[PDB]
Amino acid sequence: TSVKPIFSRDMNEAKRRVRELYRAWYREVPNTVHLFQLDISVKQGRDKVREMFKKNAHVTDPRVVDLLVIKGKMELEETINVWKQRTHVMRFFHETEAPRPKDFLSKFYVGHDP
């Protein structure tokens, strides 16, 4: 159970790195809304950032959150340096995707998926 760390020796350094990545994304959202000339608000983009951070909020392994911070830094570098187009930014907003049936009864009505 002795594993080689990526960056963080424990979870507190890991939470420090998660926190600095969230600060950098939070600062980046108005510039991303502006220069990609998006149709969303700055508040809605910061909501999407908060949603994507809370999506991974159950991880207890320091190496897994180190890789999550590394991949978030990579997505941030692809956003700041304008390497993504507008479409890659707007793929976080699943807008053309119709909303899926969530309860039992509508999933029963549409088909066979549990």
Ligand X SMILES: CCCCCCCCCCCCCC(=O)SCCNC(=O)CCNC(=O)[C@@H](O)C(C)(C)COP(=O)(O)O
Which residues make up the interface to ligand X (CB under 6 A)? 15, 18-19, 21, 25, 29, 32, 45, 48-49, 52-53, 56-57, 59, 65, 68-69, 72, 75, 89, 92
Vertex 57: Cα angle to 53 and 58 (nearest 5): 155
Binding status of residue 2 toward another protein by CB under 8 A: no
H helices present in 1-114, as ranges: 11-35, 42-55, 62-80, 86-90, 104-110
- The amino acid at residue 102 is K
Binding status of residue 84 toward another protein by CB under 8 A: yes
Of 89 and 110, which CB lies nearer to ligand X in the complex structure?
Answer: 89
For 46, list phi and psi in degrees, rounded to 5.
Answer: -70, -30
Binding status of residue 76 toward another protein by CB under 8 A: no
If you ran DSSP here, which 8-state letter would residue 59 be given? -
**Tokens encoding 29:** 């959202």
Of 6 and 75, which CB lies nearer to ligand X in the complex structure?
Answer: 75
The listed partner (ligand X, another protein, none) that binds 33, CB under 5 to 8 Å by sort, is none
Positions in 19-58 near another protein (CB under 8 A): 37, 39
